[PDB]
Amino acid sequence: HKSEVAHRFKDLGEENFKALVLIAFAQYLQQCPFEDHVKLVNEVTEFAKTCVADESAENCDKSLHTLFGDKLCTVATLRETYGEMADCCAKQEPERNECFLQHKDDNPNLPRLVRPEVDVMCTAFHDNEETFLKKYLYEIARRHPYFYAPELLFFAKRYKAAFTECCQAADKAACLLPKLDELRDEGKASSAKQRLKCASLQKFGERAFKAWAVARLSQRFPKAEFAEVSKLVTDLTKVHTECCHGDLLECADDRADLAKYICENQDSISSKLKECCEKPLLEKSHCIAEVENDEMPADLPSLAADFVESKDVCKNYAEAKDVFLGMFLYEYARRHPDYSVVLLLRLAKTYETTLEKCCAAADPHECYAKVFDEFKPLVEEPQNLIKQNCELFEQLGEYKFQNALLVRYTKKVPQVSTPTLVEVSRNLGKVGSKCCKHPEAKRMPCAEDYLSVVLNQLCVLHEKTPVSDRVTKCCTESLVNRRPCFSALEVDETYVPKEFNAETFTFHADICTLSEKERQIKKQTALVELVKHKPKATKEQLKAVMDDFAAFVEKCCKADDKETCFAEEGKKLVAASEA
Ligand SMILES: CCCCCCCCCCCCCC(=O)OC[C@@H](O)COP(=O)(O)OCC[N+](C)(C)C
Ligand SMILES: CCCCCCCCCCCCCC(=O)OC[C@@H](O)COP(=O)(O)OCC[N+](C)(C)C
Ligand SMILES: CCCCCCCCCCCCCC(=O)OC[C@@H](O)COP(=O)(O)OCC[N+](C)(C)C
Ligand SMILES: CCCCCCCCCCCCCC(=O)O
Ligand SMILES: CCCCCCCCCCCCCC(=O)O
Ligand SMILES: CCCCCCCCCCCCCC(=O)O
């Protein structure tokens, strides 16, 4: 249409318009102060209206990329503050915006945002949330310059919802802290999931991304015929591509295009999309990616007919192989929402290998007549692994559970950072606590999601500075093999325990006045070093020693005097436990 500026304002809404404009500028001009942006966001919302009023107002017919670009190159401290970047202004069109895109900083050099106190948070809220919420939005925006504007928008309107319901409450913190934490982790398990969709696209290939796409998409839209899922896949993949590139506009659009094709052919695709395609343009796509598994036609056969028995199997393969291996995955995938995508993938890898050896051969029919056998062991592993993993967690709490994982993944790899062996140890915890709260039916997919991010923030931290091969081997490995590879570590015979240095195992009264989280971390931390010291430690020598540090805290951080309770009663463990 006529002037893209009005098209956007009218259909997005002055409100949303500002939010996204704020974000968009904040994602590029990471250095400039919040107050600056506010001035931009109005100077622009004020201009925009000029078209929402008579779209043929000077400059309205310009392209948003030209507009966006033109006003960047208007900032002033552009060079003084950005430099290199000021140099895109002398370039051009297509080239000017692309130039700008190459200069946004993955890892910004700002401080960690401290989370102030419920009280000031509240007080500042009731107060003008405009700038309570816009500033914090601005803050998150610049620290994560690649996060999808509209989505960051959606988080925010929940962070808004959050203060709404707690700030006006009895005991505030109690209400909100949980929520806030929950919204926090929610965002990392989204930031990282967004940064993983891409690497995997660049590392393993377009074929791989598609494979995954057909899998996940079928499980979700099981009554959609293959050619449909197939069409939805090619689109996704492209969508997932221009988005990884990072051109927030082209990205947004595609997602909208694909968003509304689906909307316009739901009968072919799904039912459960009724209540999402009634949403406004901005959410259409998000709502959908989050839609819920559609139901199966139940009456559905068995993959045996089409993939083992017939004849022509070998022929239908050769005749264009991915189509085939795709169909295979489709069918297998749609009949098993309860499997995590990568598991259907080895099923595919497995099957693939099998032909490939089989159609090359004396008698294929009898050569592969029996793969489904090769599948059972694959499917059963993660099922046993989740079963007894959620069972162990049923006994011990999140806390006592981590501590299990803590010892376990230290003996298997005591080279790694202690703080790291602690971070991940817990993150795992939460995953247990999360996804064990589901039923078998939805257990595995849910783990793959999280486990897949956690079990990576762990790699990069290890890519930061290497410490093990095994950990580095399981990290170079394929997204498909990455998991088992970990679930297949054994405990480091080679090593020699760490070197007694006590200043460690010594706990001054500090631990009385600390918080729930911190107390546990100081405990878990020593929990590790201790294992790092006496690696061959038993599930019973430990349990004792641990029951000892207990009632030692109970102790010291209790009866009248503290402060040397710990100290005298302290050393009465240090050497004290050693047996
Ligand atoms: C409708 C607009 C309302 C205002 C929008 C901004 C509200 C957000 C308020 C944030 C206030 C708290 C800041 C803080 O201390 O948070 C710690 C954050 O770093 C946690 O960030 P998250 O929102 O969990 O992650 C969003 C960024 N991700 C998803 C790219 C990682
Ligand atoms: C030091 C790094 C630790 C790596 C973890 C080792 C690999 C296995 C970790 C066990 C998981 C413990 C957390 C938990 O309580 O959940 C149960 C998990 O075992 C379930 O995960 P999986 O069934 O492997 O997830 C399915 C992912 N698959 C299907 C692609 C393997
Ligand atoms: C060389 C040997 C020195 C021994 C001390 C050095 C490291 C100590 C090793 C234990 C590390 C802590 C283990 C852990 O992760 O949690 C332990 C806690 O659950 C202890 O229970 P608490 O509730 O703190 O104690 C309560 C006391 N009660 C149970 C008697 C009431
Ligand atoms: C299997 C879910 C298919 C949903 C297709 C909706 C496509 C909208 C854009 C896709 C981006 C969302 C990423 C995701 O679904 O994980
Ligand atoms: C001057 C800049 C105006 C910029 C407005 C950016 C608009 C983004 C609209 C995004 C529509 C997204 C649809 C989707 O994500 O599914
Ligand atoms: C159109 C997609 C065809 C899917 C082919 C099924 C074979 C299993 C794929 C497993 C992931 C492959 C990883 C890789 O290619 O290195």
CSV table of C-alpha atoms in Angstrom, one decimal, residues 183-576:
chain,number,residue,atom,x,y,z
A,183,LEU,CA,9.1,-14.8,33.9
A,184,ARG,CA,12.9,-14.6,34.0
A,185,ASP,CA,13.7,-18.2,33.2
A,186,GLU,CA,10.8,-18.0,30.7
A,187,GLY,CA,12.9,-15.5,28.8
A,188,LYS,CA,16.2,-17.3,28.7
A,189,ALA,CA,14.5,-20.5,27.7
A,190,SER,CA,13.4,-18.3,24.8
A,191,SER,CA,16.5,-16.2,24.1
A,192,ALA,CA,18.7,-19.3,23.9
A,193,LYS,CA,16.0,-21.3,22.0
A,194,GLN,CA,16.1,-18.4,19.5
A,195,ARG,CA,19.9,-18.4,19.3
A,196,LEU,CA,19.9,-22.2,18.8
A,197,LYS,CA,17.4,-22.2,15.9
A,198,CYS,CA,20.1,-20.3,14.0
A,199,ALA,CA,23.5,-21.9,14.7
A,200,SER,CA,21.9,-25.2,13.9
A,201,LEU,CA,20.8,-23.7,10.6
A,202,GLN,CA,24.3,-22.5,9.9
A,203,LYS,CA,26.2,-25.5,11.3
A,204,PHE,CA,24.3,-28.7,10.3
A,205,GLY,CA,22.4,-27.5,7.2
A,206,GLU,CA,19.2,-26.6,5.5
A,207,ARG,CA,18.4,-30.3,5.1
A,208,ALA,CA,18.7,-30.8,8.9
A,209,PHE,CA,16.5,-27.8,9.7
A,210,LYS,CA,13.8,-29.2,7.4
A,211,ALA,CA,14.0,-32.6,8.9
A,212,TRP,CA,13.3,-31.2,12.3
A,213,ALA,CA,10.6,-29.1,10.8
A,214,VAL,CA,8.7,-31.9,9.3
A,215,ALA,CA,8.9,-33.8,12.6
A,216,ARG,CA,7.7,-31.1,14.9
A,217,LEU,CA,5.1,-29.9,12.4
A,218,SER,CA,3.4,-33.2,11.9
A,219,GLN,CA,3.1,-34.0,15.6
A,220,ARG,CA,1.3,-30.8,15.9
A,221,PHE,CA,-0.9,-31.0,12.8
A,222,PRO,CA,-1.5,-34.7,12.4
A,223,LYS,CA,-4.6,-34.5,10.2
A,224,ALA,CA,-2.8,-32.5,7.6
A,225,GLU,CA,-1.7,-34.4,4.5
A,226,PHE,CA,2.1,-34.7,3.8
A,227,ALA,CA,2.1,-32.2,0.9
A,228,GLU,CA,0.6,-29.7,3.3
A,229,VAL,CA,3.0,-30.3,6.1
A,230,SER,CA,5.6,-30.2,3.3
A,231,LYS,CA,4.5,-26.8,2.2
A,232,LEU,CA,4.3,-25.5,5.7
A,233,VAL,CA,7.9,-26.7,6.2
A,234,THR,CA,9.5,-25.0,3.2
A,235,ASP,CA,7.9,-21.8,4.4
A,236,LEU,CA,8.9,-22.1,8.0
A,237,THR,CA,12.5,-22.8,7.0
A,238,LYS,CA,12.6,-19.6,4.9
A,239,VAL,CA,10.8,-17.7,7.7
A,240,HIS,CA,13.4,-19.1,10.1
A,241,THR,CA,16.1,-17.9,7.7
A,242,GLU,CA,15.3,-14.3,7.0
A,243,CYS,CA,14.7,-14.0,10.8
A,244,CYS,CA,18.2,-15.4,11.7
A,245,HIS,CA,19.6,-12.9,9.3
A,246,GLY,CA,18.1,-10.4,11.6
A,247,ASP,CA,16.2,-7.9,9.5
A,248,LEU,CA,13.4,-7.4,11.9
A,249,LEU,CA,11.1,-6.1,9.2
A,250,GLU,CA,11.4,-8.8,6.5
A,251,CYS,CA,11.4,-11.3,9.4
A,252,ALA,CA,8.2,-9.9,10.9
A,253,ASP,CA,6.4,-9.9,7.5
A,254,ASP,CA,7.2,-13.5,6.5
A,255,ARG,CA,5.9,-14.7,9.9
A,256,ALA,CA,2.8,-12.7,9.1
A,257,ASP,CA,2.5,-14.1,5.6
A,258,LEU,CA,2.9,-17.7,6.6
A,259,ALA,CA,0.8,-16.7,9.6
A,260,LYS,CA,-2.2,-15.9,7.5
A,261,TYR,CA,-2.0,-18.7,4.9
A,262,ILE,CA,-2.4,-21.1,7.7
A,263,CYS,CA,-5.2,-19.0,8.9
A,264,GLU,CA,-6.6,-19.2,5.5
A,265,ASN,CA,-6.4,-23.0,5.2
A,266,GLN,CA,-7.0,-24.4,8.6
A,267,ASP,CA,-9.0,-27.2,7.5
A,268,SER,CA,-6.1,-28.6,5.8
A,269,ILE,CA,-3.9,-28.0,8.7
A,270,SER,CA,-5.6,-28.0,12.0
A,271,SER,CA,-8.6,-27.4,14.1
A,272,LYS,CA,-7.1,-26.1,17.3
A,273,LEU,CA,-6.2,-22.9,15.5
A,274,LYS,CA,-9.7,-21.4,15.7
A,275,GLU,CA,-9.0,-19.2,18.8
A,276,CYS,CA,-5.6,-17.9,17.5
A,277,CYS,CA,-6.4,-16.7,13.9
A,278,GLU,CA,-8.9,-14.4,15.5
A,279,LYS,CA,-6.0,-12.5,17.2
A,280,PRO,CA,-4.5,-9.3,15.7
A,281,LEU,CA,-1.7,-9.3,13.2
A,282,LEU,CA,0.9,-8.8,15.9
A,283,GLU,CA,0.1,-12.0,17.8
A,284,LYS,CA,-1.3,-14.2,15.0
A,285,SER,CA,2.1,-15.9,14.4
A,286,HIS,CA,3.2,-16.2,18.1
A,287,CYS,CA,-0.1,-17.6,19.2
A,288,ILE,CA,0.3,-20.2,16.5
A,289,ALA,CA,3.8,-21.4,17.1
A,290,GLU,CA,2.4,-22.1,20.5
A,291,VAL,CA,-0.7,-23.7,19.5
A,292,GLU,CA,-1.4,-27.1,21.1
A,293,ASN,CA,-1.1,-30.5,19.6
A,294,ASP,CA,-4.0,-31.3,17.3
A,295,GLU,CA,-5.5,-34.7,17.5
A,296,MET,CA,-4.9,-38.0,15.6
A,297,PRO,CA,-7.3,-39.7,13.2
A,298,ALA,CA,-7.0,-42.7,15.6
A,299,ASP,CA,-8.1,-45.3,13.0
A,300,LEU,CA,-4.6,-45.0,11.6
A,301,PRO,CA,-2.8,-48.1,10.3
A,302,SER,CA,0.8,-49.0,10.9
A,303,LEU,CA,3.9,-47.9,9.1
A,304,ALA,CA,4.5,-51.5,8.2
A,305,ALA,CA,2.4,-51.5,5.0
A,306,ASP,CA,4.1,-48.5,3.4
A,307,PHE,CA,7.6,-48.9,4.8
A,308,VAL,CA,8.5,-52.6,5.2
A,309,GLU,CA,6.2,-54.9,3.4
A,310,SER,CA,5.3,-53.5,0.1
A,311,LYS,CA,7.5,-53.9,-2.9
A,312,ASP,CA,8.5,-50.7,-4.6
A,313,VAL,CA,9.7,-49.5,-1.2
A,314,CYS,CA,13.3,-49.6,-2.5
A,315,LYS,CA,12.1,-48.0,-5.8
A,316,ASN,CA,10.1,-45.2,-4.2
A,317,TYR,CA,13.2,-44.3,-2.3
A,318,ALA,CA,15.6,-44.0,-5.1
A,319,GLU,CA,13.0,-42.0,-6.9
A,320,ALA,CA,13.6,-39.0,-4.8
A,321,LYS,CA,14.8,-39.9,-1.4
A,322,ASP,CA,13.9,-37.1,1.0
A,323,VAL,CA,10.4,-37.0,-0.1
A,324,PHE,CA,10.4,-40.6,1.1
A,325,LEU,CA,12.4,-40.3,4.3
A,326,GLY,CA,10.2,-37.3,5.0
A,327,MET,CA,7.0,-39.2,4.5
A,328,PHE,CA,8.4,-41.8,6.8
A,329,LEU,CA,9.1,-39.1,9.5
A,330,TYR,CA,5.7,-37.5,9.0
A,331,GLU,CA,3.8,-40.7,9.5
A,332,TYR,CA,5.9,-41.8,12.5
A,333,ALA,CA,5.8,-38.3,13.9
A,334,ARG,CA,2.1,-37.7,13.6
A,335,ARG,CA,1.3,-41.0,15.4
A,336,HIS,CA,3.5,-40.1,18.3
A,337,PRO,CA,3.3,-36.6,19.9
A,338,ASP,CA,4.7,-38.2,23.0
A,339,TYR,CA,8.2,-38.4,21.5
A,340,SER,CA,10.8,-35.6,21.5
A,341,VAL,CA,11.6,-34.5,17.9
A,342,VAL,CA,15.2,-35.7,17.9
A,343,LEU,CA,14.1,-39.2,18.8
A,344,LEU,CA,11.9,-39.4,15.7
A,345,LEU,CA,15.0,-38.1,13.9
A,346,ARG,CA,17.3,-41.1,14.8
A,347,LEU,CA,14.4,-43.3,14.0
A,348,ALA,CA,14.7,-41.6,10.6
A,349,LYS,CA,18.5,-41.7,10.6
A,350,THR,CA,18.3,-45.4,11.6
A,351,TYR,CA,15.7,-46.2,8.9
A,352,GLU,CA,17.8,-44.3,6.3
A,353,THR,CA,21.0,-46.1,7.1
A,354,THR,CA,19.1,-49.4,6.9
A,355,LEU,CA,17.9,-49.0,3.3
A,356,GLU,CA,20.9,-47.5,2.0
A,357,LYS,CA,22.6,-50.7,3.1
A,358,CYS,CA,19.6,-52.8,2.1
A,359,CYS,CA,18.5,-51.6,-1.3
A,360,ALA,CA,22.1,-52.1,-2.2
A,361,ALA,CA,21.9,-55.7,-2.0
A,362,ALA,CA,21.0,-59.2,-2.8
A,363,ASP,CA,17.6,-59.2,-1.2
A,364,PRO,CA,16.4,-55.9,0.3
A,365,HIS,CA,12.9,-57.3,1.4
A,366,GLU,CA,14.6,-59.6,3.9
A,367,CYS,CA,17.5,-57.3,4.6
A,368,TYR,CA,15.4,-54.6,6.2
A,369,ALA,CA,12.2,-56.5,6.7
A,370,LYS,CA,13.0,-56.0,10.3
A,371,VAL,CA,14.1,-52.6,11.4
A,372,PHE,CA,11.3,-51.8,13.6
A,373,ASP,CA,13.5,-54.0,15.8
A,374,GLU,CA,16.3,-51.5,15.6
A,375,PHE,CA,13.9,-48.8,16.8
A,376,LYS,CA,12.8,-50.3,20.1
A,377,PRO,CA,16.2,-49.8,21.9
A,378,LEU,CA,16.2,-46.2,20.7
A,379,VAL,CA,12.7,-45.3,21.9
A,380,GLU,CA,13.1,-47.2,25.2
A,381,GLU,CA,16.3,-45.3,26.3
A,382,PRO,CA,14.9,-41.8,26.9
A,383,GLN,CA,11.7,-43.5,28.3
A,384,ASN,CA,13.6,-45.4,31.0
A,385,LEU,CA,15.8,-42.3,31.5
A,386,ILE,CA,12.7,-40.1,32.2
A,387,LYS,CA,10.9,-42.7,34.1
A,388,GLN,CA,13.5,-43.4,36.8
A,389,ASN,CA,14.7,-39.7,36.6
A,390,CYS,CA,11.3,-38.4,37.6
A,391,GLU,CA,11.0,-41.2,40.1
A,392,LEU,CA,14.2,-40.3,41.9
A,393,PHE,CA,12.9,-36.7,42.0
A,394,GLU,CA,9.7,-37.9,43.6
A,395,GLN,CA,11.6,-38.9,46.7
A,396,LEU,CA,13.9,-36.0,47.2
A,397,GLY,CA,12.9,-32.3,46.7
A,398,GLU,CA,14.1,-30.1,43.9
A,399,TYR,CA,17.0,-29.3,46.3
A,400,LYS,CA,17.8,-32.8,47.5
A,401,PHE,CA,17.5,-33.9,43.8
A,402,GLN,CA,19.9,-31.4,42.3
A,403,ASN,CA,22.4,-32.6,44.9
A,404,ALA,CA,22.0,-36.0,43.4
A,405,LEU,CA,22.8,-34.7,39.9
A,406,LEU,CA,25.5,-32.6,41.5
A,407,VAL,CA,27.6,-35.5,42.8
A,408,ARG,CA,26.8,-37.5,39.7
A,409,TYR,CA,28.0,-35.0,37.1
A,410,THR,CA,31.1,-34.2,39.0
A,411,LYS,CA,32.5,-37.6,39.3
A,412,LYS,CA,31.8,-38.0,35.6
A,413,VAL,CA,33.7,-34.7,35.0
A,414,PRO,CA,35.6,-33.1,37.9
A,415,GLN,CA,37.6,-30.9,35.6
A,416,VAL,CA,34.9,-28.4,35.1
A,417,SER,CA,34.4,-25.2,37.1
A,418,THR,CA,32.9,-25.6,40.5
A,419,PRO,CA,30.5,-22.7,40.0
A,420,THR,CA,29.6,-24.2,36.6
A,421,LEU,CA,29.1,-27.7,38.0
A,422,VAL,CA,26.7,-25.8,40.3
A,423,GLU,CA,24.8,-23.6,37.9
A,424,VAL,CA,23.9,-26.4,35.5
A,425,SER,CA,23.4,-28.9,38.3
A,426,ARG,CA,20.4,-26.9,39.3
A,427,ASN,CA,19.1,-25.7,36.1
A,428,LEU,CA,18.8,-29.5,35.5
A,429,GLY,CA,16.9,-29.6,38.9
A,430,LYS,CA,14.2,-27.1,37.7
A,431,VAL,CA,13.8,-29.2,34.5
A,432,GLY,CA,13.1,-32.2,36.7
A,433,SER,CA,10.7,-30.1,38.7
A,434,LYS,CA,9.3,-28.8,35.6
A,435,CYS,CA,8.6,-31.5,33.1
A,436,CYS,CA,8.1,-34.3,35.8
A,437,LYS,CA,4.9,-32.4,36.6
A,438,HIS,CA,3.5,-33.7,33.3
A,439,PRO,CA,2.3,-37.2,32.4
A,440,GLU,CA,4.3,-39.7,30.2
A,441,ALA,CA,2.2,-38.4,27.3
A,442,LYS,CA,4.0,-35.0,27.4
A,443,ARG,CA,7.1,-35.8,29.4
A,444,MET,CA,9.8,-36.2,26.7
A,445,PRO,CA,9.0,-33.3,24.4
A,446,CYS,CA,9.0,-30.9,27.4
A,447,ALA,CA,12.5,-32.2,28.5
A,448,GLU,CA,14.0,-31.9,25.0
A,449,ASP,CA,13.0,-28.2,25.0
A,450,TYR,CA,14.7,-27.2,28.2
A,451,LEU,CA,17.4,-29.9,28.5
A,452,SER,CA,18.3,-28.7,25.0
A,453,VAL,CA,19.0,-25.2,26.1
A,454,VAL,CA,20.5,-25.9,29.6
A,455,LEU,CA,22.7,-28.5,28.1
A,456,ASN,CA,24.2,-25.8,25.9
A,457,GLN,CA,24.5,-22.7,28.0
A,458,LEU,CA,26.9,-25.3,29.4
A,459,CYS,CA,28.8,-25.8,26.2
A,460,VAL,CA,29.4,-22.1,25.4
A,461,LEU,CA,30.6,-21.5,29.0
A,462,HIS,CA,32.9,-24.4,28.1
A,463,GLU,CA,33.7,-22.9,24.7
A,464,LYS,CA,34.6,-19.8,26.7
A,465,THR,CA,37.4,-21.8,28.3
A,466,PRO,CA,37.9,-25.5,27.6
A,467,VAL,CA,38.3,-27.9,30.5
A,468,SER,CA,37.3,-31.4,29.1
A,469,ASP,CA,37.2,-33.3,25.8
A,470,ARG,CA,34.2,-35.4,26.7
A,471,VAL,CA,32.3,-32.3,27.4
A,472,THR,CA,33.8,-30.8,24.3
A,473,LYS,CA,33.0,-33.9,22.3
A,474,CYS,CA,29.4,-34.0,23.3
A,475,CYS,CA,29.3,-30.3,22.3
A,476,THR,CA,30.7,-30.6,18.8
A,477,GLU,CA,28.4,-33.5,18.2
A,478,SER,CA,25.1,-33.3,16.3
A,479,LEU,CA,22.0,-31.8,18.1
A,480,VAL,CA,20.7,-35.3,17.7
A,481,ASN,CA,23.7,-37.0,19.4
A,482,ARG,CA,24.4,-34.3,21.9
A,483,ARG,CA,22.1,-35.7,24.5
A,484,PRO,CA,22.9,-39.4,24.7
A,485,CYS,CA,26.6,-38.4,24.4
A,486,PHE,CA,26.1,-36.7,27.8
A,487,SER,CA,23.8,-39.4,29.2
A,488,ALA,CA,26.7,-41.6,28.3
A,489,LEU,CA,29.5,-40.1,30.4
A,490,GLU,CA,31.2,-42.2,33.0
A,491,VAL,CA,33.3,-41.3,35.9
A,492,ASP,CA,36.8,-40.1,35.5
A,493,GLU,CA,39.1,-42.9,36.7
A,494,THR,CA,42.1,-41.0,35.7
A,495,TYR,CA,41.8,-38.2,38.1
A,496,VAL,CA,43.5,-37.5,41.2
A,497,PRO,CA,41.3,-35.8,43.6
A,498,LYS,CA,41.6,-32.1,44.3
A,499,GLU,CA,44.1,-30.8,46.7
A,500,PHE,CA,43.0,-30.3,50.2
A,501,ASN,CA,42.9,-26.5,50.9
A,502,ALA,CA,40.7,-25.8,53.6
A,503,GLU,CA,39.7,-22.1,53.8
A,504,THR,CA,37.1,-23.8,51.7
A,505,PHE,CA,35.3,-26.2,54.1
A,506,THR,CA,34.8,-23.6,56.7
A,507,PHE,CA,31.6,-21.8,57.3
A,508,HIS,CA,31.5,-18.7,59.4
A,509,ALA,CA,28.2,-17.5,60.8
A,510,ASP,CA,27.6,-15.7,57.5
A,511,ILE,CA,25.3,-18.6,56.4
A,512,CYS,CA,22.6,-17.7,59.0
A,513,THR,CA,21.9,-14.3,57.6
A,514,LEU,CA,21.9,-15.3,53.9
A,515,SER,CA,18.9,-16.2,51.7
A,516,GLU,CA,17.3,-19.5,50.8
A,517,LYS,CA,19.0,-19.7,47.4
A,518,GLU,CA,22.5,-18.5,48.5
A,519,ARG,CA,22.6,-20.8,51.6
A,520,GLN,CA,22.1,-23.8,49.3
A,521,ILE,CA,24.7,-22.6,46.8
A,522,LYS,CA,27.3,-22.2,49.5
A,523,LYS,CA,26.3,-25.7,50.6
A,524,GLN,CA,26.1,-27.2,47.1
A,525,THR,CA,29.5,-25.6,46.2
A,526,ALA,CA,31.3,-27.3,49.1
A,527,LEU,CA,29.2,-30.3,48.3
A,528,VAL,CA,31.1,-30.4,45.0
A,529,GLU,CA,34.7,-29.5,46.2
A,530,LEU,CA,34.2,-32.3,48.8
A,531,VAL,CA,33.4,-34.8,46.1
A,532,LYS,CA,36.3,-33.2,44.1
A,533,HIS,CA,38.4,-34.1,47.2
A,534,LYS,CA,37.2,-37.6,48.1
A,535,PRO,CA,35.9,-38.7,44.7
A,536,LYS,CA,35.4,-42.3,45.6
A,537,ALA,CA,33.0,-41.1,48.4
A,538,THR,CA,30.1,-43.4,49.1
A,539,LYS,CA,26.3,-42.9,49.1
A,540,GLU,CA,26.5,-43.5,52.8
A,541,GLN,CA,29.8,-42.0,54.0
A,542,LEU,CA,28.5,-38.9,52.2
A,543,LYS,CA,24.9,-39.2,53.5
A,544,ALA,CA,26.4,-39.3,57.0
A,545,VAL,CA,28.9,-36.5,56.5
A,546,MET,CA,25.9,-34.5,55.0
A,547,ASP,CA,23.6,-35.3,57.9
A,548,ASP,CA,26.5,-33.9,59.9
A,549,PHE,CA,26.7,-30.5,58.3
A,550,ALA,CA,23.2,-30.3,59.0
A,551,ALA,CA,22.7,-30.3,62.5
A,552,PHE,CA,25.9,-28.5,62.7
A,553,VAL,CA,24.1,-25.4,61.1
A,554,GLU,CA,21.1,-26.1,63.2
A,555,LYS,CA,23.7,-26.0,65.8
A,556,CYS,CA,26.0,-22.9,65.4
A,557,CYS,CA,23.5,-20.7,63.6
A,558,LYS,CA,21.3,-21.3,66.8
A,559,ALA,CA,21.8,-21.7,70.5
A,560,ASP,CA,22.8,-18.2,72.0
A,561,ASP,CA,26.3,-17.7,70.9
A,562,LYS,CA,27.1,-18.3,67.3
A,563,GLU,CA,30.3,-17.4,65.8
A,564,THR,CA,32.7,-20.0,67.1
A,565,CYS,CA,30.0,-22.5,67.5
A,566,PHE,CA,31.0,-22.6,63.9
A,567,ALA,CA,34.8,-22.6,64.3
A,568,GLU,CA,35.4,-25.0,67.2
A,569,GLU,CA,32.5,-27.3,66.3
A,570,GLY,CA,33.6,-26.5,62.8
A,571,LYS,CA,37.1,-28.1,62.6
A,572,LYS,CA,35.3,-30.9,64.5
A,573,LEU,CA,34.2,-31.9,60.9
A,574,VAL,CA,37.0,-30.7,58.6
A,575,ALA,CA,39.3,-33.5,59.8
A,576,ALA,CA,36.4,-34.7,61.7
